[PDB]
Structure 1
Amino acid sequence: NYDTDFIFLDIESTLGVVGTNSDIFAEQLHKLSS
């Protein structure tokens, strides 16, 4: 592949490469609006 690496394909077809109160209220409101 054209950026100085070489890619290979396995036989189980895996491609590989060789290369170089506030936060409490906030959490409770986001949990109540969930």
Structure 2
Amino acid sequence: NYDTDFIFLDIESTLGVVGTNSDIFAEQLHKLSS
């Protein structure tokens, strides 16, 4: 590929590359309103 890497294709097609209070209220409200 055109930015100094080489891609290769494995026979099982893996492409590889060789390169170079309120807090508890908030938590319980996001619980109870979901």
CA offsets 1:1-34 (integer angstroms, 9 cap, x no match): 0000000000000000000001100000000111
Gaps of 5+ in 1: none
Gaps of 5+ in 2: none
Identity fraction in percent: 100
RMSD: 0.4
Distance, in Å, in 2 between the alignment partners of 1:13 and 1:24 is: 48
Aligned pair count reads 34
